[PDB]
Amino acid sequence: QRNEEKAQREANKKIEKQLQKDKQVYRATHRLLLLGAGESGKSTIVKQMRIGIFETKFQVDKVNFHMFDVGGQRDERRKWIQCFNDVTAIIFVVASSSYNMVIREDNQTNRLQEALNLFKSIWNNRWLRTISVILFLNKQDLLAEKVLAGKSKIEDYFPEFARYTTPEDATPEPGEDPRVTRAKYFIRDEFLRISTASGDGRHYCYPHFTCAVDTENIRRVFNDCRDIIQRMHLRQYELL
């Protein structure tokens, strides 16, 4: 009779209230994706940010942030990468000191080049057309120790580095050699060249130089997310 309908209506009302509260909570929280090479060094960033899928919840300035990382699924083609369509930013971790070494057992297919190809695939994705990338370049001090040593020359592995010159309007570190500065800025420009070509105002790449003992990664991600949302809102109103 109508008693069943009344009970169903009461259950519907309770469920609707519960999902209203859940919607408030979900809209309060921001989502991030931690993507990088296997030996890139995402574990160090994850430990720094915290202080088959790994989820770490951290909040800064009373803003809830959620970071998702998947490592079990390692394939040339990823179907789970289309699932992360509502994430505010995709964190990319690249080993900037892995230019001279190769893990594919083949010549000239350097791990840095593999990371660049992966970044190109992520950027030139139909589903990831509005997701900005926060790029972290781990192990900058390993890169410094490598460049100050004569063991490896980037020109031997990256031909464009021979004719490359340091930018005049750059921001060198307070205590850094010219050679390491040139190397790190060339590596950053390698990713930025891919970043600029495809996207047109929809999404941007934020490059950061990170050491193995850096502790400002939490604030850097917060600022990058704030800038991402500000740019998205500005473009939605056709200002920027």
The answer to whether residue 77 forms part of the interface with other proteins (CB under 8 A) is: yes
How many residues sit in the footprint of other proteins (CB under 8 A)?
Answer: 52
Least CB distance to other proteins at residue 155 (A): 22
Binding mask 210-239 for other proteins (x = CB under 8 A): ----------------xx-xxx-xx-xxxx
The answer to whether residue 85 forms part of the interface with other proteins (CB under 8 A) is: yes
Written as six digits, the tokens of 104 are 């594919």
**Phi, psi of 59, deg, nearest 5:** -125, 140
What separation in angstroms does the CA of 71 have from each of 33, 34, 39, 63, 224?
12, 10, 11, 26, 24
> Please, is 60 exposed, middle or buried when counting C-beta atoms within 10 Å of its C-beta (0-12, 13-18, 19+)?
middle
Within 8 A by CB and 6+ apart from 144, the residues are 176, 177, 180
The answer to whether residue 8 forms part of the interface with other proteins (CB under 8 A) is: yes
Task: Write b or e for each residue in 200-236: b if 16 or more Cβ atoms lie within 10 A of its Cβ, otherwise e.
Answer: eeebbbbbbbbbeebeebbebbbebbeebeebbeeee
Q: Of 1, 3, 5, 165, which one interacts with other proteins (CB under 8 A)?
A: 5
Interacting residues with other proteins between 119 and 148 (CB under 8 A): none
Least CB distance to other proteins at residue 110 (A): 24
Residues at the binding site are 36-44, 69-73, 138-141, 212
- Binding residues for Mg(2+) are 43
The contact set with other proteins (CB under 8 A) reads 5, 8-9, 11-12, 15-16, 18-19, 22-24, 26-28, 30, 52-53, 55, 61, 63, 68, 70, 72-73, 75, 77, 79-80, 83, 85-86, 167, 169, 192-193, 196, 204, 206-207, 226-227, 229-231, 233-234, 236-240
